[PDB]
Design a protein around this nucleic acid. Structure first.
Lengths: 86, 34, 56, 100, 115
RNA sequence: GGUGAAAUGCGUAGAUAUAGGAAGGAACACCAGUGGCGAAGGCGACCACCUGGACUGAUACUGACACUGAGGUGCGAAAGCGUGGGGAGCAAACAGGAUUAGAUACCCUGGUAGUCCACGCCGUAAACGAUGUCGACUAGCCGUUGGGAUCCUUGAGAUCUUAGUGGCGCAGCUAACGCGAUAAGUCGACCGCCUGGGGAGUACGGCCGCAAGGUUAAAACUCAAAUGAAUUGACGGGGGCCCGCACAAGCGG
């Protein structure tokens, strides 16, 4: 979510340095933001208007993973072995 | 005044004619001002 | 430029005699600056730099 | 980060405000927090009563304190003080001057 | 006693008109209502009866001095402006009227609308 | 001396009430705007913190990753419902007081639930733009909100460009009303739904709910109709104009 967090999650998922847009980087930028927002909703449980911005991040990650799994499972298995997913 | 409670359905009924009496004010008077 | 709760010589020009904020149909002011006006009023008003009601 | 604190003090206590402020500066510098502006206005007359007073002493300051430096600074009139009303007002940058 | 200047209220409801003369020390001298002059019932919540009620505030205040007065008006009813001209006529050279009508900033909710 | 008209709380207990103080809840005048934000329900004081999405500008990247969506699963005004705080004001119930054939009501004076807060439930509204979502195209003119860019430029500004929000209106469509780049036009992808009026969104079953009940959902029987929009009239305790000894000056049962 931060400026320097979001620059560093780009930096170890890069794949050909100018890249910020591969489904590697986007799933990693989403997965970090989902995890950091889980602190918010233990403390702020009545906030439903911001859960919906989180469920959008869950669904935007699930579509990107189904994209990449159907396309290159070798990049899918490496990404899923990072990030602590599945 | 603020004598009675105005239930906010009938209080959200606004603009009597202000897009007529201030918008068509320079329209219906154009029979002479041309 | 960006009007501010400290600048009371600007804020007093849109405060009516009874203390009330004057609308945008009276003074010719843009809608961004009006809603920026009625925040700097309400900050100076809170901070006792301006009254809420006319009385004192 | 950047804040704009402006607080009143009760006018009978107007002689240790040079210490009040000073204490607030050293408490902000203890986390390296910069102080971009510090103005003491007059003993101005309020536009209404605050705790039945009619005159008060204004101090404005612009601060870049971290997070807990603000919280202890805000608690130096939240827990108790003889300072009244203040708005902390998060800003975005540093400044120059006011009071004509 | 003899006090030379005072502040003089008018409570100007839709039902009644109450006029109370005080001093700047706010203590009531002479009160006269629009139904205390023998009205009792329906008719005169009108500027007529406040013209009758404001003068009785006058010639009972003309016991302890009170040349100049300051008029505080409070309420929406008729008899609002016909109690301040019924007040200089009793020999008062009142400085300025002042309006104090209480307005909530949002406040309590009012009663139900009459049908 | 409220009002279509009066009746309850007050003076060996001071009466609407002071220029005064304190407490407590609850709502945030002015700003306020065919304004804004949100998927809808919704959200109005101010400041801080935590956070969501949009808009916007260039540039770089991924390379169809998209659209819709039966099931399902979330979120849903109000009022209700447990369980515990709270309780100003207002107020279903209810007590009186009026008004009337009666008044079980509309008006008055009160007033417990509720409204408020916390957690849990319900899952409904004329939840409406009575208009599913997404995409592409099709005359103009006049406002407005958030941006951006160009304009001699002072902006007092002007023009084009986007994303919203409105007012007219060409084509077209429409039974008409009307809609008309925010389509009800022109087409496309997918979903939901409808099949005369009653019976009836009702029984019975199932599921859900603590309840109130919701949701899914019929038949027997009955009638020749219901229904939409516009037209002429008549009518109105609708409105606006107008008239006459219609209204009261110097008549008389």
């Amino acid at each position: 979510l931060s400026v320097e967090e979001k620059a560093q999650i780009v930096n170890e998922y890069k794949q050909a340095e100018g890249d910020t847009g591969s489904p590697e980087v986007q799933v990693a930028l989403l997965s970090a933001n989902i995890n950091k927002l889980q602190d918010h909703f233990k403390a702020n449980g009545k906030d439903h208007h911001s859960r919906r911005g989180l469920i959008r991040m869950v669904n935007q990650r699930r579509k990107l993973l189904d994209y990449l799994k159907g396309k290159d499972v070798s990049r899918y298995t490496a990404l899923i072995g990072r990030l602590g997913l599945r | 005044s603020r004598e009675f409670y105005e239930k906010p359905t009938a209080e959200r009924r606004r603009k009597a004619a202000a897009a007529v009496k201030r918008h068509a004010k320079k329209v219906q008077r154009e029979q002479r001002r041309r | 430029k960006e009007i501010d709760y400290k600048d009371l010589n600007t804020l007093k020009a849109y405060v009516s005699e009874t203390g009330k904020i004057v609308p945008s149909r009276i003074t010719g002011t843009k809608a961004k600056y009006q809603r920026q006006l009625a925040t700097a009023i309400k900050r100076a008003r809170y901070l006792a730099l301006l009254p809420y009601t006319d009385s004192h | 980060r950047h804040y704009e604190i402006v607080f009143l003090v009760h006018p009978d206590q107007s002689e240790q405000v040079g210490g009040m402020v000073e204490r607030y500066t050293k408490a902000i510098e203890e986390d390296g927090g910069k102080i971009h502006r510090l103005e003491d206005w007059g003993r101005r007359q309020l536009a209404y009563a605050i705790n039945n007073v009619h005159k008060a002493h204004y101090v404005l300051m612009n601060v870049e304190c971290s997070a807990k430096a603000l919280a202890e600074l805000e608690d130096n009139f939240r827990a108790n003080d003889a300072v009244i009303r203040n708005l902390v007002m998060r800003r975005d940058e540093a400044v120059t001057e006011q009071s004509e | 006693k003899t006090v030379v200047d005072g502040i003089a209220h008018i409570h100007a409801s839709f039902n009644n008109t109450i006029v109370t003369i005080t001093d700047r020390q706010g203590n009531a001298l002479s009160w006269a209502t629009s139904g205390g002059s023998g009205f009792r019932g329906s008719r005169k919540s009108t500027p007529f009866a406040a013209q009758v009620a404001a003068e009785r505030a006058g010639q009972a205040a003309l016991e302890y001095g009170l040349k100049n007065l300051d008029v505080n008006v409070k309420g929406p009813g008729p008899g609002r402006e016909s109690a301040v001209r019924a007040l200089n006529a009793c020999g008062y050279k009142i400085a300025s009227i002042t309006d104090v009508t209480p307005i909530p900033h949002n406040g309590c909710r009012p009663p139900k609308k009459r049908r």
